[PDB]
Amino acid sequence: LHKEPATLIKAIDGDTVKLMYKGQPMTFRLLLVDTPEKYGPEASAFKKKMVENAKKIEVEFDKGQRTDKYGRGLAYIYADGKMVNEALVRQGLAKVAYVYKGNNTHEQLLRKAEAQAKKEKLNIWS
């Protein structure tokens, strides 16, 4: 997999973000995470801060289908090299979702993060 540059336009929700990608606006849905929205507001504020504070945002498509039926890019999003998808799960602000259409590269990574949050009774796991 490869990271590509993008620019933040707008944080939408814990699990969705609008980016300029290849010099057009596109909406991205985070791979392999389910966020609430309860911890919905907390999940959204965490996502928001992570992307808005980042100096560099990058998009990494997986090896599976790259867009959902709503036209959203399905990707791992990084802020300053740290994966947002992972960060949400590790913080107990998202659960790991089922693999969608072959996009499973970071599934074990995320499951590890989730197990740890759960062991810590953190946020959603409290």
Structural biology method used: X-ray
Q: Is 96 left (phi over 0), alpha (psi -120 to 50) or beta?
A: beta
16 is in an annotated binding site: no
Q: How far apart are CA 28 and CA 89, in angstroms?
A: 17
């808005």: which residue's tokens?
52
The resolution, in angstroms to one decimal, equals: 1.8
Q: How far apart are CA 2 and CA 8, in angstroms?
A: 19
Q: Is 12 within 8 Å of 27 (Cβ atoms)? A: yes
- Catalytic residue annotation: 29, 37, 72
68 is in an annotated binding site: no
Torsion of CA 18, 38, 87, 45, to 10 degrees: 50
CATH of domain 1-126: 2.40.50.90
CB neighbour burial string for 24-34, b if at least 16 within 10 angstroms, e if fewer: eebbbbbbbbb
Residue at 126: amino acid letter: S
Pick the closest to residue 55 from 93, 81, 76 (CA basis). 81
Pick the closest to residue 12 from 34, 56, 45 (CA basis). 45
Q: How far apart are CA 125 and CA 96, in angstroms?
A: 13
Phi and psi, residue 76, nearest 5° = -85, 130
């949050």: which residue's tokens?
117
Pairing relationship of beta strands 73-79 and 82-83 according to DSSP bridges: antiparallel
67 is in an annotated binding site: no
DSSP string, 78-120: EETTEEHHHHHHHTTS-EEPPP-TT--TTHHHHHHHHHHHHHT
Query: Which are the residues after which the chain is interrupted (C to N > 2.5 Å)?
Result: 37
